[PDB]
């Protein structure tokens, strides 16, 4: 009929061109209802302090506090030295170093020797 | 220079009987005015330095950083003043009198003449904000941070003391003046090698150098204000005056034993300029900024130039008092909201808009807006680079760019956008924080307008 | 364009090259040539700062305009026969610079066509 | 000046905008044809622009293919 | 103020493109129930309206009739 | 100044005015409480095509979870009351 | 298919409810409570701040050299220098090929 | 080019703020007549962008395309130029005869 | 906005949206009046036509090719109302908007003005304070033992009551708060 979409990781692909979604389980239904029950548990139990007259302050998201904990804290508990991770510790930590090393060393290397040798166009060149 | 010296150890027993409730009044209006009085340092000489007695003197570039610390002093005191409120009378005099022993011991520290006494007092730095830090900290992460702090100064302070009593043994003086008068080339050696090593280490962990930088963030995460804002403002200088101090002895071999910190100063500015971006905690932002900008100056000392060493002094002024404002901001919002996250309270600019605008102006301070002496600084830095080698113009200039994009957009997250909707204590901005944020950022302006006293000895 | 499309299309060889002209030495063809005239000497160009690139053999013409913008300054349209005295000396430049070009053009087509011959006799 | 919504009407104008529309319309149609009369040649040309095929042999200086 | 809205059967989709699309339409089996409501935009003001060399020509006439007369009052300024 | 301050009366009236330009709904015999489906025997697409006319009517869009389930002109005038804070 | 009792029940409480709050947020006639020449602008925005430059130019910064450099005027075949008094000579004989 | 733009711009703002903060040009209608100056002032700041004889845009513009007619430039850059010097009068057209001829697209309350 | 979703969407639903999206593109495509009238009526016999047939399966899997239909054909650039969610005046007024709490923090001297609206502030802040707890108790009564299942709340069912949870909706700041 037409040419197809080919959905990506930054363009990902449209609810209604998704075929899971034109193919429904009775299994599928319940697990909806329940994902609507909790989401819904989770709505009035915010709504019931965030209407409340008494309270003042901060009303603690303990998602917020788990996301927080997990990027920052609980990261190294969970590290384990494995093959990935140690040679992408490596590369990542050690060759950018390395090609920066190399690249400087290189270019001062040629620009000392132009100097002994005699030309660089060093008039006017005062100040350092 | 006793003159300033003996006023500080006058504000310890003044602090000490002073009544309940006048220690703060008394303790903000003597610092200021010994402030004042510390401002008489600043006429400079053209050739030597002010050699006021054979242990004390001043130059061109103590002179700006003894101003710094003594008007430091106050603005640490109005900011610690909200938090302490509960604390017992006691407990308060014992806070101002670490305050007070850290800018005493940072005031004979940067205008120490030997290299041992300057050791000494730059050590003895050491133990009152270990303390402050781990006995006003607020989480159970102060005392991580606080043994962090302490041993990564130490293993690279230590070396530093058996080199320094190597080299008055083998020269006979550690006596500054002495050292630069009858210096001598180093030869290359791996004696001279490790020598090298030994001198240049501690002052490497003290800026601190990218991949011994860890300590920094723990200890400015868990820092009450006033431990932040010291820790930022002067106690990361200590290692570029040291630098700049002892590098005169280490030449030629600095010449290519720089080739490996250069590096990690220059891609470490990249990376800690990266994290930034990425940062769910304000404080750990501003940390990770600190210490990008650290390393700028680490590049500045190391390729030993004297626009280089100009634009570090004006660089070290400038770092110091933007991440003061910015640790007082951020510490603002902390007490209004009880949490450090960045996306928590959100869209303060329709609740706050004075500290809205200083928000804004210590964001624009921070990313080198010109023609603030923080751009003078970073733009002197990078012309001397670029006479180092053309090629560092790719990094400096990632580093711009990845600069102005964290500092905005750390702007835009806390200050824009809709405010949260459950959050009801947000009261309005009280005197004392706004005349914090405006005695933070006035001196900024004012010495934009004469920048040539804070360009240091070489112009 | 049609110079073009003969160049990049034809025997470029045959066409004269821009950047490397002239190719033939300024006698080849001509008996006698006179010199081109110069009526405005380095000082008064140096005096009236003309330009690096007004400085042709035409700026006489420019300082007379200028001369005459500056003298009648209220009344900017005072100045129609000056303007129309330069752009005609310009355009005359244009010309000469167009009958050089057609005149190496067509030394290039003589010499080909001779070179050719030449080679034809000596086949014989 | 007051005017009001008028819900599927044409909106109530005013003698003064279009007055002024006209006025400036007419302004820039009248400057443009007075400028093309008194300076076409900025639009057409001025001088003539020749035909170098047509340019004599002599003129240009060359001989006639005896050298 | 306080307008009131006009009368709602003045709208006739008669005499207008509408009409070609109800024909169009019909010759299908189909019909248009929304062309009344469209018909406001082709009755009033919005009757006709100009092309767009049209347009271009807005103030055309007065214009050349003010040259006409500067070019005969400067040619006849001729006469000294 | 901008958009004079519309009231609950323009509200009803209009919608009125724009129902009553619709070929499926006899005049006289719509009013206010009419309901879509039963009084005037209309479909689910003619309620969406009713809505949308709104829609382009009042300068606004209605998401379809809300649309879906108006079904009477004073429900309608009562949601566009509401969206736009109209309390006279 | 449309409201059930009890949506339509909260909708109209809300409704009342919402529409009383905004009839309340109006003011009453006295509730902003307030507690108890022809060109002057030229002078005060133009003419003060051009003496003050003016002054600051001619006897501050004309004081040091060079601070303030003028472009040389243009000199023409034909004009007389206002200092020396000399004049120009004339631009050499025009063949006037028009 | 100041000139005309900022004119064109504040044309459009005109437009924007009239037709309740609409911007879409495909529910502009009938504008010609409905904002006589509007039009005018937007006709006259198209024909100058375009760079018709003896306007402020001719000046220049007109002086731009003829110098770089006659230099010894890209052959690909200036074809991209002519072709962009067509594109310009394409959307000046589009933007005219979009919002200010035709009938009336935008909603009922004028 | 204003309702509280379902678990899932029934096909009905699916397809009046569907039409709904396919209408709005069709007429940005079609600028004119006239021929979005046209091509509106051709669209809506192309739905007509479908609309008896009763075999379900076949009746998704129409409404599949239909969903794919219209990704390709859709416009890249369909009007959008300025305030909707991706208008040109999305959020335009949300820096206008002040929460009513921050009237609390204003200072005596503030409030010397505007009495009579603070008097009336007085009265809404005792309403709500005394209605609260009625409200708590009456959520309370009608939800089952496991939790709600859909976040739709229910009305005062007492003629002194109020609707549960109602003191954030009803004071709302504007749409034009400024
Ligand atoms: C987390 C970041 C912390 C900070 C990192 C600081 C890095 C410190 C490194 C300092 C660099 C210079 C050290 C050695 C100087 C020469 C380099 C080496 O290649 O020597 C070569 C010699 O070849 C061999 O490399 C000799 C050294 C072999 C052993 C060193 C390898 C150590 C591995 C690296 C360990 C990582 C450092 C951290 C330790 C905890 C040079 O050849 P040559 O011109 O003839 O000798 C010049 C020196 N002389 C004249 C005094 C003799
Ligand atoms: C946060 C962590 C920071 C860690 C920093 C600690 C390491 C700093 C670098 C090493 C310092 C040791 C230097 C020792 C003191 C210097 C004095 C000196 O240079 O004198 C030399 C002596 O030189 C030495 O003996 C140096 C020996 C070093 C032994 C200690 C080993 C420590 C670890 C070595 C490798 C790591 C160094 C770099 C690590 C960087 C941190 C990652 C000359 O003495 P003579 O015997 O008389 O020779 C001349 C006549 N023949
Ligand atoms: O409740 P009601 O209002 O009566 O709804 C009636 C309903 C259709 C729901 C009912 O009769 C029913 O359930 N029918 C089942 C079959 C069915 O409707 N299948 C869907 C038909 S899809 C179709 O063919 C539409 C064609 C057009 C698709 C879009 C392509 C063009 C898009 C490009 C835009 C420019």
Redesign the interface.
């Given at each position: 009929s037409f040419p197809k979409y080919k959905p990506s990781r930054l363009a990902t692909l449209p609810a209604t061109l998704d075929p899971a979604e034109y193919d429904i389980s009775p299994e599928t239904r319940k697990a909806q209802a329940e994902r609507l029950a909790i989401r819904s548990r989770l709505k009035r139990e915010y709504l019931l302090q965030y209407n409340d007259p008494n309270r003042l302050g901060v009303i603690e998201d303990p998602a917020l506090i788990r996301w927080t904990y997990a990027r920052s804290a609980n990261i190294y508990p969970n590290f384990r030295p494995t093959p990935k991770t140690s040679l992408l510790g490596a590369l990542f930590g050690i060759g950018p170093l390395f090609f920066w090393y190399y690249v400087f060393k290189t270019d001062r290397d040629k620009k000392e020797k132009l100097i002994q040798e005699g030309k660089l166009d060093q008039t006017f060149n005062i100040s350092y | 220079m006793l003159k300033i010296i003996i006023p500080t150890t006058m504000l310890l027993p003044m602090t000490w009987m002073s009544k309940h409730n006048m220690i703060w009044i008394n303790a903000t209006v003597h610092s200021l005015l010994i402030s004042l009085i510390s401002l008489s340092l600043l006429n400079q000489l053209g050739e030597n330095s002010l050699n006021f007695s054979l242990t004390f003197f001043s130059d061109s570039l103590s002179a700006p950083l003894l101003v710094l610390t003594t008007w430091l002093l106050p603005l640490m005191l109005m900011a610690s003043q909200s938090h302490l409120s509960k604390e017992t009378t006691t407990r308060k005099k014992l806070y101002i009198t670490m305050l007070i022993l850290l800018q005493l011991f940072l005031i004979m520290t940067f205008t120490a003449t030997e290299l041992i006494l300057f050791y000494i007092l730059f050590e003895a730095t050491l133990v009152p904000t270990l303390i402050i830090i781990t006995r006003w900290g607020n989480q159970t992460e102060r005392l991580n941070a606080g043994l962090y702090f302490l041993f990564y100064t130490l293993a690279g302070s230590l070396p530093l003391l058996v080199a320094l009593v190597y080299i008055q043994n083998t020269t006979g003086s550690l006596n500054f003046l002495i050292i630069h008068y009858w210096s001598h080339p180093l030869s290359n050696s791996w004696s001279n090698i490790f020598m090298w090593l030994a001198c240049i280490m501690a002052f490497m962990v003290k800026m601190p150098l990218y991949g011994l930088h860890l300590w920094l963030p723990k200890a400015h995460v868990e820092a009450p204000i006033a431990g932040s804002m010291v820790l930022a403002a002067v106690l990361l200088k200590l290692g570029g005056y040291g630098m700049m101090r002892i590098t005169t002895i280490l030449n030629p071999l600095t010449n290519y034993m720089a080739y490996p910190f250069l590096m990690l100063s220059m891609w470490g500015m990249i990376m800690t300029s990266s994290i930034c971006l990425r940062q769910t905690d304000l404080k750990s932002l501003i940390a990770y900024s600190s210490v990008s900008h650290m390393a700028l100056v680490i590049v500045a000392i190391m390729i030993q130039t004297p626009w280089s060493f100009m634009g570090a002094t004006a660089l070290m002024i400038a770092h110091g008092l933007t991440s003061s404002m910015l640790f007082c901001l951020a510490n603002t919002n902390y007490e209004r909201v009880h949490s450090r996250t960045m996306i928590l309270a959100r869209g303060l600019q329709t609740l706050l808009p004075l500290m809205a605008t200083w928000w804004l102006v210590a964001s624009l301070t921070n990313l080198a807006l010109p023609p603030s002496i923080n751009l003078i600084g970073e733009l002197f830095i990078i012309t001397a680079s670029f006479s180092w080698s053309n090629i560092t113009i790719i990094l400096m200039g990632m580093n711009m760019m990845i600069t102005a994009l964290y500092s905005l957009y750390m702007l835009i997250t806390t200050q824009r956008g809709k405010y949260t909707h459950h959050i009801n204590n947000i009261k309005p901005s009280f005197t004392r924080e706004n005349a914090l944020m405006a005695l933070h950022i006035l001196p900024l302006l004012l010495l934009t307008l004469n920048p040539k006293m804070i360009l240091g000895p070489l112009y | 364009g049609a110079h073009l499309a003969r160049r990049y299309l034809g025997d470029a060889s045959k066409e004269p090259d821009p950047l490397r002209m002239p190719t033939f030495p300024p006698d080849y063809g001509f008996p006698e040539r006179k010199e081109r005239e110069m009526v405005a000497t380095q000082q008064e160009m140096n005096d009236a700062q003309l330009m690096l690139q007004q400085r042709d053999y035409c700026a006489h013409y420019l300082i007379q305009l200028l001369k005459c913008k500056r003298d009648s300054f209220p009344n900017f349209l005072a100045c129609k026969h000056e303007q129309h005295d330069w752009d005609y000396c310009e355009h005359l430049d244009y010309v000469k610079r167009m009958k050089e070009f057609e005149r190496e053009r067509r030394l290039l087509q003589r010499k080909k066509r001779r070179e050719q011959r030449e080679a034809e006799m000596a086949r014989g | 000046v007051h005017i009001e919504p008028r819900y599927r009407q044409f909106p109530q104008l005013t003698r003064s905008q279009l007055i002024q529309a006209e006025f400036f319309s007419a302004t820039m149609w009248f400057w443009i044809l007075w400028r093309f009369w008194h300076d076409s040649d900025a639009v057409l040309g001025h001088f003539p622009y020749p035909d170098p095929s047509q340019w004599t042999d002599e003129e240009l200086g060359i001989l006639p293919d005896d050298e | 103020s306080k307008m009131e809205l006009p009368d709602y059967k003045q709208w006739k989709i008669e005499g207008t493109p509408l009409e070609t699309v109800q024909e169009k339409l019909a010759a299908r089996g189909l019909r248009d129930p929304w062309g009344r409501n469209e018909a406001w935009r082709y009755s009033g003001g919005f009757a006709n309206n100009v092309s767009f060399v049209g347009a271009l020509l807005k103030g055309f006439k007065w214009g050349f009739a003010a040259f006409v007369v500067a070019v005969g009052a400067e040619y006849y300024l001729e006469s000294q | 100044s901008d958009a004079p301050p519309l009231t609950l009366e323009a509200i009803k009236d209009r919608v009125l005015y724009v129902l009553k330009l619709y070929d499926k709904i006899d005049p006289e015999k719509l009013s206010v409480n009419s309901h879509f489906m039963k009084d005037l025997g209309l479909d689910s697409l003619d309620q969406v095509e009713i809505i949308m006319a709104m829609e382009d009517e009042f300068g606004f869009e209605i998401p379809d979870i809300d649309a879906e389930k108006l079904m009477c002109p004073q429900e309608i005038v009562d949601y566009i009351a509401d969206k736009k804070d109209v309390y006279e | 298919?449309?409201?059930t009792p009890?949506?339509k029940?909260?909708?109209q409480?809300?409704?009342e409810?919402?529409?009383?709050?905004?009839?309340?947020q109006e003011?009453?006639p006295r509730?902003?409570?307030?507690?108890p020449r022809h060109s002057i602008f030229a002078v005060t925005h133009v003419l003060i701040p051009v003496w003050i430059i003016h002054y600051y130019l001619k006897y501050h910064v004309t004081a040091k050299p060079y601070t303030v450099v003028e472009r040389?005027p243009?000199?023409?075949?034909?004009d007389t220098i206002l200092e020396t008094g000399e004049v120009?000579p004339l631009?050499?004989?025009?063949?006037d090929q028009? | 080019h100041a000139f005309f733009k900022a004119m064109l711009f504040m044309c459009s703002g005109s437009i924007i703020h009239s037709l309740n903060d609409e911007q879409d040009i495909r529910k502009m209608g009938g504008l010609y007549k409905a904002m006589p100056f509007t039009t005018t002032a937007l006709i006259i700041g198209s024909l100058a962008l375009t760079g018709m004889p003896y306007l402020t845009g001719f000046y220049s513009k007109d002086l731009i395309i003829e110098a770089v007619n006659m230099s010894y430039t890209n052959a690909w850059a200036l074809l991209m130029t002519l072709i962009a010097t067509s594109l310009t009068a394409a959307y000046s057209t589009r933007i005219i005869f979009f919002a200010f001829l035709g009938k009336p697209r935008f909603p009922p309350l004028v | 906005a204003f309702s509280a979703p379902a678990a899932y969407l029934t096909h009905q639903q699916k397809v009046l949206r569907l039409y709904k999206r396919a209408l709005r593109h069709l007429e940005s495509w079609c600028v004119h009046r006239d021929k979005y009238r046209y091509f509106a009526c051709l669209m809506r016999a192309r739905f007509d036509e479908h609309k008896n047939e009763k075999d379900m399966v076949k009746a998704t899997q129409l409404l599949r090719q239909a969903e794919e239909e219209f990704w390709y054909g859709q416009h890249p650039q369909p009007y959008i109302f300025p305030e909707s969610p991706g208008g040109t005046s999305y959020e335009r007024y949300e820096c206008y908007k002040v929460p009513e709490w921050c009237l609390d923090d204003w200072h005596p001297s503030e409030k010397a003005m505007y009495p009579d609206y603070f008097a009336k502030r007085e009265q809404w802040k005792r309403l709500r304070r005394e209605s609260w707890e009625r409200e708590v108790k009456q959520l309370q009564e009608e939800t089952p033992p496991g939790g709600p299942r859909t976040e739709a709340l229910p009305p005062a069912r007492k003629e002194g009551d109020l609707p549960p949870l109602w003191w954030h909706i009803v004071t709302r700041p504007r749409e034009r708060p400024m």
């Open positions: - | - | - | - | - | - | 298919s449309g409201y009890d949506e029940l909260r909708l409480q809300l409704r409810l919402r529409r009383r709050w905004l009839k309340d003011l009453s509730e902003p409570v307030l507690p040389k243009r000199i023409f075949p034909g120009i631009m050499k004989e025009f063949p028009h | - | -």
